[PDB]
Structures are given as structure tokens and as C-alpha cells.
Amino acid sequence: TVDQQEILNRANEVEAPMADPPTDVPITPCELTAAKNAAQQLVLSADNMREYLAAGAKERQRLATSLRNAAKAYELTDTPRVATAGEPNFMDLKEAARKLETGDQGASLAHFADGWNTFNLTLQGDVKRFRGFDNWEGDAATACEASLDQQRQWILHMAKLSAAMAKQAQYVAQLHVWARREHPTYEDIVGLERLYAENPSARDQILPVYAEYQQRSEKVLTEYNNKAALEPVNPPKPPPAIK
């Protein structure tokens, strides 16, 4: 069975443009190191992701141009992992609050998460391009179905990873929000410092309040280190097309 015209149609179909990924760069929600690294981690992950998708397109162009062969006759590497200090660094109260309160507080991450999620949803419905044939059979035809089907699966993995990377982002965004809610404010630290600095006989009982302020802080910083240490997003290579 040879439908000549069906080959040509499906070639054009397979190498027509797909969705452009987002070009938004994430920015640290604040000045704590853990936050900064998390944002670094995500620039690598996303850069690598965008590269692998450009390679995919190149490989879909080869598959297409190879289908037209048939009709007629009838560098990439892993994502780097960013280092993460094993010990927090329990800096003095006032500075922890200063660092935590300075930055966009997650707006970039949220916008980043947003755009990668939309990519995942829009990409996972452009797969009709990789379906089987109707009027083309035998070794030649069936082999090409395997090659289309391969990249169909790759696409769905890449779409899953987009969604995974976007989850990391908004997870840190809300992790930060937790941290602000839980950490003593600059204002209140200064305020408590002032209450000490003016009620001199009371200072004996002001002490264990200030102690619990430090404990509260350590607890936050510890949990920020750990939970903000993201995994790299390591896309698998686009599979070879066909000749």
C-alpha cells in the first residue's frame, strides 16, 4: 500500500512550528543564599530545557525531510547542580530579617511558574502530528510509525518536565511566604530591642523573649536551606529520526 500524498502531508504536519517556550528569567525572592541558589538552579534547568527543545525541532525536520525521501521513490549535556551550604549560617536576628524582607518576594518565580505551566498544557495537545498512517503499509511504513511514535513520547516527557520545573518555582515562592509569616519582622526586632533599651529593671524578664526570637529565626533559616535546595531538571535527548 502506497498513498504517496499521505507521506507528504504528514511530513509537513510533523515539521510545522510548535509552541515557543517562555523566555522569562526567574529572580531570587530575597537575599538569603538558599533563595539565590534556588533561582540559579532554575536558570540552568530552563536554559537546558530550551536547548533540548530546539534540538527536538532539528530532529523533527530530519524525520520530515526523510519522509519525503520515501514519497519520492514511488554537543548536548546534563544540567549542572548548584551547590548548597550544608550548614545554614545562623546570622544575627536583625540581618536575617533584613535579607528576608529585601527582594520581589516571589513575583518572578510565580510569573515563571505560570509560563512553564502554560507551555506544558499547550504542548501536550500537539501530538496528532505523530499518529499512525491509514493507506501505507509494510516494513517501510511501519518503521516510520515507530520513529514518529518515539518523538511523540519524548514530547510528553518534556511537557511533564516543564510542569515539574514550574512546580519547583511556585514551591519556593510559597516556601518564602511561609518564611515571612514565621520569621520575626525587622520592625518587631528593633522594637523589642528598644523595649529592652528603655525598661532597664524589666530586662531580666525581656531576656527569654529575645531568646525565643532567635530560636524562631534559626528554625526558619534551617528549613529555608533544606526545602529551597532544588533538583536539576535533566531532559533526555531527542531520539534520532530516520534516513
Side-chain angles (χ1 to χ4, degrees):
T1 318
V2 175
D3 200 318
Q4 170 144 318
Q5 186 68 320
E6 192 176 8
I7 316 300
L8 295 161
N9 285 36
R10 295 290 312 282
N12 295 342
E13 188 159 355
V14 71
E15 71 159 12
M18 305 187 79
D20 286 299
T23 41
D24 174 19
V25 178
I27 309 296
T28 184
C30 81
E31 294 312 272
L32 283 177
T33 305
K36 290 177 151 156
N37 294 339
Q40 284 171 343
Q41 190 57 83
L42 288 152
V43 190
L44 298 172
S45 296
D47 277 38
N48 213 15
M49 281 291 304
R50 267 177 291 266
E51 295 273 313
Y52 276 60
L53 294 160
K58 280 303 312 188
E59 204 80 66
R60 291 197 305 282
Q61 186 216 294
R62 288 176 201 169
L63 179 47
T65 206
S66 192
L67 306 200
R68 300 195 192 78
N69 263 20
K72 205 160 301 207
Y74 282 124
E75 299 194 53
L76 309 184
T77 70
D78 312 4
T79 306
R81 184 193 274 290
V82 184
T84 69
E87 261 49 55
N89 187 30
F90 301 132
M91 63 206 77
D92 109 290
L93 281 178
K94 216 183 311 198
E95 207 215 333
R98 204 181 43 66
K99 291 237 187 85
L100 200 50
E101 274 145 70
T102 325
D104 78 343
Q105 311 287 306
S108 52
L109 289 183
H111 186 272
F112 168 91
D114 199 71
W116 279 103
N117 199 63
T118 304
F119 184 65
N120 150 66
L121 299 169
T122 56
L123 188 70
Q124 87 186 248
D126 186 21
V127 286
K128 192 215 288 259
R129 64 171 64 204
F130 308 114
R131 66 191 185 286
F133 298 92
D134 309 327
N135 306 142
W136 192 39
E137 281 140 54
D139 294 340
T142 322
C144 282
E145 295 186 326
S147 199
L148 294 157
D149 161 78
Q150 274 162 25
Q151 291 178 344
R152 194 179 51 73
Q153 291 175 79
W154 179 76
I155 286 302
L156 301 187
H157 196 180
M158 291 304 282
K160 198 205 171 182
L161 292 182
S162 299
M165 187 179 47
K167 266 204 176 82
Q168 290 176 312
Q170 64 185 342
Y171 174 76
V172 170
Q174 290 141 42
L175 159 69
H176 181 60
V177 170
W178 178 77
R180 287 292 307 281
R181 202 191 80 215
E182 288 292 330
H183 203 279
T185 37
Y186 186 91
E187 193 176 312
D188 292 22
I189 292 155
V190 168
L192 181 54
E193 282 180 1
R194 186 170 217 194
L195 187 80
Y196 191 94
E198 291 167 354
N199 298 38
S201 39
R203 289 168 188 183
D204 219 310
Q205 297 194 321
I206 296 172
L207 235 66
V209 174
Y210 197 79
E212 288 208 33
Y213 273 51
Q214 293 171 320
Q215 293 171 54
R216 281 178 63 197
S217 185
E218 289 180 49
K219 179 187 137 160
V220 175
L221 295 176
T222 311
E223 273 263 301
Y224 212 134
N225 281 101
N226 299 20
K227 302 289 195 285
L230 296 182
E231 287 294 317
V233 181
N234 229 119
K237 315 200 167 167
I242 202 157
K243 301 204 151 184

